[PDB]
Design a protein around this nucleic acid. Sequence first.
DNA 1: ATCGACCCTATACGCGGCCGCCCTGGAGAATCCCGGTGCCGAGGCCGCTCAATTGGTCGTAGACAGCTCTAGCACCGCTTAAACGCACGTACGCGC
Length: 66
Amino acid sequence: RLVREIAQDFKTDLRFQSSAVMALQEASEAYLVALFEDTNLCAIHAKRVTIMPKDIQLARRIRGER
DNA sequence: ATCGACCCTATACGCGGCCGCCCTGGAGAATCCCGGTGCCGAGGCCGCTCAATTGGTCGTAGACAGCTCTAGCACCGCTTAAACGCACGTACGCGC
């Protein structure tokens, strides 16, 4: 349902193959798991154990995602 | 034998001197601007030629309509796995 909302803002009256949604979910979760790996490394580097929004922002800054 | 007076010493204070801490002017580099100079790369013109242009023919990918058949959407109900909220407290964030 979330992806349907995002697509409605791009083009109206769209249908999705069930395999298209599953592929979107696969790449999304893999991106988020990998991001939390980099996020956890940043938090440990700051002599901390708890992840914080500054850790994710630092990770995406190093990746070049602005 | 005892009391008063005098001298000596210890102590307290009194203020003076010295030190440490807290607030402003000014000195000196390092930077920006500026007018003179000067030089070498930019911008321009010259002329050559090869790539763009043009006119033309042949063919096929593609536009288009027609038909069909998968699968994407809608709906619904039952179960329950999972999600939400609240309570507690301990160990982790962070400030020193």
